Structure 1
Amino acid sequence: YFGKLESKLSVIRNLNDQVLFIDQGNRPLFEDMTDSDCRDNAPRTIFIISMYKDSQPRGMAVTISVKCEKISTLSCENKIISFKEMNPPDNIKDTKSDIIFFQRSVPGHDNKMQFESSSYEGYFLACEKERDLFKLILKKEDELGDRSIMFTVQNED
Structure 2
Amino acid sequence: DNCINFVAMKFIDNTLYFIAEDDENLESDYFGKLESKLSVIRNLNDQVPRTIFIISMMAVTISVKCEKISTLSCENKIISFKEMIIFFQRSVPGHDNKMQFESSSYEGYFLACEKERDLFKLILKKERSIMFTVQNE
TM-score (norm 2): 0.66
The aligned residue for residue 151 of structure 1 is 133
What secondary structure sits across from 1:72 in the alignment?
A: strand
C-alpha displacement at 1:19, in angstroms?
4.6
Mapped to 2, the partners of 1:68 and 1:44 lie a distance apart of 6
Q: Pick 1 or 2: higher relative contact order, CA cutoff 8 A, min separation 6.
A: 1
Residues of 1 paired with 2:111 and 2:42: CA distance?
25
Please list, as runs of the form range in 1=range in 2, the aligned pairs for 1:38-117 lying within 5 A after superposition.
44=50, 46-51=52-57, 60-86=58-84, 99-117=85-103
Q: CA RMSD in A?
A: 2.9
Structure 2 residue matching 1:78: 3-state secondary structure = helix
Q: Which has the higher strand share?
A: 2
Counterpart residue type for residue 50 of structure 1: S
Unpaired runs of 5+ residues, structure 1, are 1-14, 52-59, 87-98
Equivalent residue for 1:22? Answer: 10
TM-score of the superposed pair, with normalisation by structure 1: 0.59
8 Å Cα contact 2:64/2:71 also seen in 1: yes
- CA 1:19–1:102 in structure 2 vs 1: closer, same or farther (change >3 Å)? farther
Q: What are the ranges of 5 or more consecutive residues in structure 2 without an aligned counterpart?
A: 22-40
State the shift of 1:135 in Å.
0.3
Alignment pair present for 1:31 and 2:19: yes
